[PDB]
Amino acid sequence: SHSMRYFFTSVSRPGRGEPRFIAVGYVDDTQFVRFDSDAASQRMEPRAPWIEQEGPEYWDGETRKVKAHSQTHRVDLGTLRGYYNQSEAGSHTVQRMYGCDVGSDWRFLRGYHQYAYDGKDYIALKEDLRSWTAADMAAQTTKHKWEAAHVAEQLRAYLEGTCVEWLRRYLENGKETLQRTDAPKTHMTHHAVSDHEATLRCWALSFYPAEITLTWQRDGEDQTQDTELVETRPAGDGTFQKWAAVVVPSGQEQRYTCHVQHEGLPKPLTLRW
């Protein structure tokens, strides 16, 4: 599958001035556009080489739309302060994420449009793209407004139309990277932690996309006890890193296997010391 996602964050500044607004666009795990209210350009900016070929009409259009998004969030911070009976003195946060997935058939798979206030679910479009999940009575007020304004119908048209069409355009224009899988480069390290115990660390480096599974087995059965698994982390060059470690009795390293699952691997890899 492939995804296009836009992420918006607006943080109010009660001391002085307007909210800090940051928008980022992704195709899969690749950032391709950004807007930051604090940046000099006041434009939607490219962050991937394959979006740079889009002409001036594209950049003017996306700049106009992302500035309109920022004003909507500014108004929403005011509305939500009202709904929750909060003072003008505190900083608050609105977050929005929307976008679309295409499946193995390159057709529309799913759409989403999710909103949060102060880091908690507020309102979300259901998978049917016809109904809303409102977390509380403030969000229920928004749900009634959005039902009357036919927001779900407008979003459904975008998510099943423009969103998937432009995702497919970007995937073709950027295919050299976006449709390339980078299989993890895997190795094991060995460190004594005592006279009687050793740590085996299974590394997965320079992989894309970010989704990966590292599992330890002992004599061919999954082991979670005496293991540590770090959160997948960005390398900073567009690829990802992860490791998993197990503590084992010194001399028994040969019993342990690290199993690596990734879209870039025809069959999962097995590593043994």
Binding site: A68, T72, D76, Y83, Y122, Y158, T162
Partner: peptide, 10 residues
């Protein structure tokens, strides 16, 4: 490509 229809406020 961003949503073109103006966003409806909460």
């Amino acid at each position: 490509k961003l949503v073109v229809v103006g966003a409806v406020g909460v």
